[PDB]
Amino acid sequence: GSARDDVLIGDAGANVLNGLAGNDVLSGGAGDDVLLGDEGSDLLSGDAGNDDLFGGQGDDTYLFGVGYGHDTIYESGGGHDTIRINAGADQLWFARQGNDLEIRILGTDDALTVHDWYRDADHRVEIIHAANQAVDQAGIEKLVEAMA
Ligand SMILES: [Ca+2]
Ligand SMILES: [Ca+2]
Ligand SMILES: [Ca+2]
Ligand SMILES: [Ca+2]
Ligand SMILES: [Ca+2]
Ligand SMILES: [Ca+2]
Ligand SMILES: [Ca+2]
Ligand SMILES: [Ca+2]
Secondary structure (H helix, E strand, C coil): CCCCCCEEECCCCCCEEECCCCCCEEECCCCCCEEECCCCCCEEECCCCCCEEEEECCCCEEEEECCCCEEEEEECCCCCCEEEEECCHHHEEEEEECCEEEEEECCCCCEEEECCCCCCHHHCCCEEEECCEEEEHHHHHHHHHHCC
16 A cells, blocks of 8 residues: 555455555455555455454444455544445344454354454444444444343
8 A cells, every 4th residue: 555545456365455544445355364444544345255454543444244254353443433234234143252242144154353342442343334224332232232
């Protein structure tokens, strides 16, 4: 990446993509990728394979869906980070696992983990979108508690 707004597209191998400053778009493609949004409002999509997603500071967006495998988000900060999951809300299973939040797509091996979600506010993503539903932090908590 560069200080500008970049679009960084991986290939089928395990890739490291670093957006640097600016509002970037990072798409890993297949393989196990490491994606960094760094400073700015970035959109990170690991795609297939098991990807580590570091949106960095700023308000970052993370994509997930069927066939995305097991991806882990490591947030650093931002008051309006978001996850956008391409599935119906009733296909989602929310659980606490230690200090992580784990979101599974029912009927699949696809799972999205937010590392240290329960440690502190800077590790949280503030809105989780399913197809036509935006779930805020109080809503996420209620799903976790209900599905325990
Ligand atoms: Ca950036
Ligand atoms: Ca950049
Ligand atoms: Ca890749
Ligand atoms: Ca990938
Ligand atoms: Ca960022
Ligand atoms: Ca962020
Ligand atoms: Ca993935
Ligand atoms: Ca946040």
